[PDB]
Amino acid sequence: VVDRQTGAVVALNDLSVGRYDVTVDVGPSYTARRDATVSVLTNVLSSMLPTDPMRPAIQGIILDNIDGEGLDDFKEYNRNQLLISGIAKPRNEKEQQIVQQ
Amino acid sequence: VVDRQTGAVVALNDLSVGRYDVTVDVGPSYTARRDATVSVLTNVLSSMLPTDPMRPAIQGIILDNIDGEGLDDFKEYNRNQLLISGIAKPRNEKEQQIVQQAQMAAQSQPNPEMVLAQAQMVAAQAEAQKATNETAQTQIKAFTAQQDAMESQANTVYKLAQARN
Amino acid sequence: DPMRPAIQGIILDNIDGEGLDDFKEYNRNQLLISGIAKPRNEKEQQIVQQAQMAAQSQPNPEMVLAQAQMVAAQAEAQKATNETAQTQIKAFTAQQDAMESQANTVYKLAQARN
Secondary structure, three states, X not given: OOOOOOOOOOOOOOOOOOOOOOOOOOOOOOOOHHHHHHHHHHHHOOOXXXXXXXXXXXXXXXXXXXXXXXXXXHHHHHHHHXXXXXXXXXXXXXXXXXXXX | OOOOOOOOOOOOOOOOXXXXXXXXXXXOOOOOHHHHHHHHHHHHOOOOOOOOOOXXXXXXXXXXXXXXXXXXXXXXXXXXXXXXXXXXXXXXOOOOOOHHHHHHHHHHOOHHHHHHOOOXXXXXXXXXXXXXXXXXHHHHHHHHHHHHHHHHHHHHHHHHHHHOO | OOOHHHHHHHHHHOOOOOOOHHHHHHHHHHHHHOOOOOOOOOOOOOOHHHHHHHHHHXXXXXXXXXXXXXXXXXXXXXXXXXXXXXXXXXXXXXXXXXXXXXXXXXXXXXXXXX
């Protein structure tokens, strides 16, 4: 139930599915998904008190999506700090059995 | 999977690779990569509270990329401070076996000290642990006293029997 | 910030002027003892750093001693960990003597019949 997939040798349109449960709206135009994530998380931030408990988690999630040159070590360190706090949900390759262990 | 490479005697273009997963955008023009790294890290900074925990890490990463004349000792000291904190990821030449080994040695060394700084209770807990086996000698002595009591009861019964003559 | 004193020391190391010999030498000495100057293998790698190592090994008994009121208690407990077992040993000796006296008094009962 956690995956939405379509599959066919030639695209099959099932007429019995019916209307989707989405609504057409408008919003800002973003070149990449990271821009949308960072913008929405920053909008969520800056409306919270400095003493709020989830602000470090918001900051970590925001920093996880920042892209640039020469940020490999910093991003890896931030991801490890987020993993040891039970927020990153290791993607079952090597960090689910090493960092969490 | 952590490296992206192409190789050929004469550049080979594999038509089966397909479109890349990058998007064309625009941004500020930088003469060197260090400029881009410093600019993006500084933009990340200055929006964080002074009491934030990762601010020293951001400052260290920023100072790692600053270039100039006569900065060898300062840069080396900053890099060592970043290495001992598990942020620099030694590049497997000499500091993976020297600086990190020294850090592990200086982490294993003060464990007796850090427990000892508040181990005044260790005396009491050792005393209690030994008493947990030592005070049972009193129960053992009570058992021996009961055995001696029954023995003396038999002896005094014999004494009563003998005293009749 | 923690690195600001280091930045200030490095800045002051590069200032040039007349009549600044003693101040510059003092600043360089405190920069050397803090592991930031990297002695250039002439005399301070074997004198200033050696003196720093000596003055670092010297006050370890002092720094533990400033909080070693617990050392007396832990030493007392450590010795008691071998010393209180004499009570169990004495209990064992008392048990052996009790068996010996039981045999002796049984013989006494046998003898008193005449």
